[PDB]
Amino acid sequence: PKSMQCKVILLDGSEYTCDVEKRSRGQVLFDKVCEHLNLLEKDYFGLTYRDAENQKNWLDPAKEIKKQVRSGAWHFSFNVKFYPPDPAQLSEDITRYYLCLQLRDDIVSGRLPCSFVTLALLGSYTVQSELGDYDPDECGSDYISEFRFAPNHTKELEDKVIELHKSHRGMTPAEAEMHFLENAKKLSMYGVDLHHAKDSEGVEIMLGVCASGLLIYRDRLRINRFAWPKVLKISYKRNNFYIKIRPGEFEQFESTIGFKLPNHRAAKRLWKVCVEHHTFFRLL
């Protein structure tokens, strides 16, 4: 039996190495990574790989790894796929821990925009979780944390993290992580997967995919939202992605909204993430 070496970037930034039989389905590797991580609430997570265009794709657990990575390296990242709207409802602290690590990368990367005060509050919970109670002996008037809190660090931001860290004395890691999540879950881009597209007139929009449905970001003013229940059919054809928007009460016919994606693979990727979000968050 021939085995392939897999490398997986974990959410703490470290590399897990393992081997799977070369005809393995994605679930085989995913199960190995989740066992390594002592993760039981696996449904919220997945592996990503980079395709031949260098685009992030979800590894399909049901399909052969080799038919997905094709010509590319067997290199992956472990990521949150379905961001829970109610992380308090997760059954395990270790699940909430991995969710915090993902969100910290979401913030530092700038995928999850955040006000100054929320950057400092989220940072102060991370510090409390990881160092425990504020100690002045480690931090002088000039202190700068090893922790990455933001896309752009300022001394003002560092000072505000420490001011809020002082307020969290006696807070346990599980408690600070839950507070982190209670704040993060309210951010307008929490759990939003963004896809570049053009509307039916060629105007450049973003389509966001999340628990509450499909969002269409046009021009700061008027952001159109389609709750999942209001979506009967999701389809793609060539470079185009279509949704069927239900007939309102007393309306005779469904309506159709079409989008142009960069290329055929981008249209298919958006369709698959929409179907998966619809399936996952159906009874939300």
Ligand SMILES: CCS(=O)(=O)Nc1ccccc1F
């Ligand atoms: C931990 C639960 S959650 O992910 O916040 N919300 C949810 C998601 C899918 C179905 C039902 C649900 F309640």
